[PDB]
Amino acid sequence: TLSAEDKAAVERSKMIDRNLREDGEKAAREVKLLLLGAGESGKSTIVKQMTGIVETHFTFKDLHFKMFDVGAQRSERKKWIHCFEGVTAIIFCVALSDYDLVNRMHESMKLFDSICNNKWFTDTSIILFLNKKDLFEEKIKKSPLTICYPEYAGSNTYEEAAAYIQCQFEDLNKRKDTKEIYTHFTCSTDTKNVQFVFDAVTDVIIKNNLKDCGLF
Amino acid sequence: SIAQARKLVEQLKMEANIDRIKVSKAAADLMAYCEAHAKEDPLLTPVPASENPFRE
Amino acid sequence: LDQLRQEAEQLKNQIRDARKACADATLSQITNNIDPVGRIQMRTRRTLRGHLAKIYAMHWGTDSRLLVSASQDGKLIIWDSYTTNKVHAIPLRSSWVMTCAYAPSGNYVACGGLDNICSIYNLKTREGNVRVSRELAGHTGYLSCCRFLDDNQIVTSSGDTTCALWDIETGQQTTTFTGHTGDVMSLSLAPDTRLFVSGACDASAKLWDVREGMCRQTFTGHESDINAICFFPNGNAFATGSDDATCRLFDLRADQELMTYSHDNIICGITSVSFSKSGRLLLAGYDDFNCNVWDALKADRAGVLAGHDNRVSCLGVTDDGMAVATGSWDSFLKIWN
Amino acid sequence: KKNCCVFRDDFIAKVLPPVLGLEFIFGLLGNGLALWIFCFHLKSWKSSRIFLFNLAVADFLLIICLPFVMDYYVRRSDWKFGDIPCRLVLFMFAMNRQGSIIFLTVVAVDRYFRVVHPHHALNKISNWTAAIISCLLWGITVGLTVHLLKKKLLIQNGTANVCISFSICHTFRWHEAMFLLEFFLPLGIILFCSARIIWSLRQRQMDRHAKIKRAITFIMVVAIVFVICFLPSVVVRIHIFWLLHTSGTQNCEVYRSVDLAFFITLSFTYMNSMLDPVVYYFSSPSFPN
């Protein structure tokens, strides 16, 4: 019953639908990562080895990643944090050379507590990066690990310094049945952090596929 | 500093001399508007299924 | 110094005293004798498919047939509501879009989001494609709403606690509106296009003056962030939806609050607020996947619009008042009637 | 003709009916409930859901076709119906058997491409493509099972129309070959796929999670069920193959007891039709237990 000029409009709509479907299929094969931190915490170097939103694209082993760095957004985080509900994982950058200064480790712990226990990210895995290892060496050699963390029962060597900073961060997780925290003690130049991110995302994707099976 | 407080208090004076009518008159005007245009609203007075463009 | 402090306090007390003195009878007492509107039942007449992500905004055309929707998958689709056809599909540079608008003439659309930029698109060109005509920059925070005044003017509100009036011909801020102390989340234009109201996150709403000046009303009363706002068709009242699961109707001439539309089974916040052509029904969108219809003159619920499988994020009513369209986070639009 | 020798020896008619009834009630309940959940009760619909739904459809056809089974069994065996009904029942049985097996194998292969190759493009295919594959496999199995329709399968020894498609003859025809293949080839594919899924998850240190353990167990149990169900029948079939090849066609005594044995084990092929729903649909964190 359609007229001459209605069938052509239907055909145009069908072509638009086909283009939209193709674009969606192409865009469903990419990994989306959200990058967070406390500022001047090694985000720059982490981006190096790999206004508003600052996207960044890189490829590794025939896999296309996208890293979103919110950065300069100084508005209320509560009003736009739900836009990233479907990200594959969250990368969190912490500097180990900030314990003897102002306290910033407490701010980083507060931000990690706020993000990890958010209601939107109840199943989003978190990849923890601990930076400034080289400076941390002499910093713990000179300054003891008590100015920031009182009631510390341990020595002043790197053997215990690496721990008791990972344990506290991993203890802020409360739903230890849906998400997992991956930790890496990165440094200034390692050239292997991309492999760590790849492993974490492969685990996450395997879990999502198993969920899609219904197995699940 | 004091400039922001001065601006705020100036805004307060500016909003402090507005003319205000009683609530009863506003209520009556709201009722009058809601009653006058009562037949022209196809949502609370459903139209027959011959002039409905979304029928089917 | 202090003298400013107690001067401000005394002015606030005087304003409260005047507001209280102007109150003699509530709206419930005036509208007690009005008969109930009865149960309002609407059925989904159309469903628009094609978005592959959460839908964040929508707007109707002035001809009550074409509408534009924005979603997080980076697309801006223009629909033909009568036949559910697609007319255009504009790909955006930034996928983080949270607002859209449709020009009264029908030649332009707008969008914006976390990129802090409002983009204007031209739909009627001699080349048969939609191209960007101007990108407006200057806001230092995410854009939350935008509305067309003409083909050469647009009002935007952003997350840097400011609202600005632009000039699309030159891309410059003609006027800047300041006074809020929180993210501005929505705005609505008066029918005569001379005043507009904004709802910020400081639990307050203000009435501006587009021609010249600044705020003059500063209505208060909510207990949390205001997410939506809408003018009454008469142009002498407006409604606000907030995060405390409460909608309120404010009046301009008496400068007060008339009613509150609350319940006891509702605890989730309101995402959108709209009126009807007569102004008797008030449609609101909630986070519990529903959409309630409130008798505006009696503050009594008179229907439910169920059928969405996720949060209802946008809502609109046609100019002729013949349909209601709701978008949600499950990537579907439904036209009710 | 005069190359086959069949019987019907009471004992089968004595034992089977309660067993078919017990399987029938549970199968109807489970698969009807499963279909009811699948339609207008389950919102999300992905490819694996389509494959599981097709498995449910085949299983459902088999359960609605069980009632008649108590016929060449009740009243010993007379099959009061005609030629066409006999052909229809036998064809439907075979079709439903091979469709369910094919969809089990498809499910196993689909789960193999999601743990061993998580980034393969096969893991994200359109629902339309899933429907196309479903129709193609349905066509395949029907095409393999049409040869029953042409021939006559109502051989009657007198006052007893013995509706059987399994007769002791020496031709290695369509039916026996497909009966052996539908076990052996899907067994190989399932055992290969289930081995890699368990071993990759074991090696990449994913066993520490709690949900992974249940998935591992429920992957092993699927192979256990498939092996406990279809194996005895083909074992008995190969056994009678050995006797039939070593012997001739006469001396029917050697072929006497093998009949009731074959059908006793054949009852397990439907016993699968009732054990399948719980294992595949019900036993899954996807829908709340």
Ligand SMILES: O=C(O)c1cccnc1
């Ligand atoms: O294939 C079957 O399931 C079958 C064939 C014959 C008789 N009863 C069952």
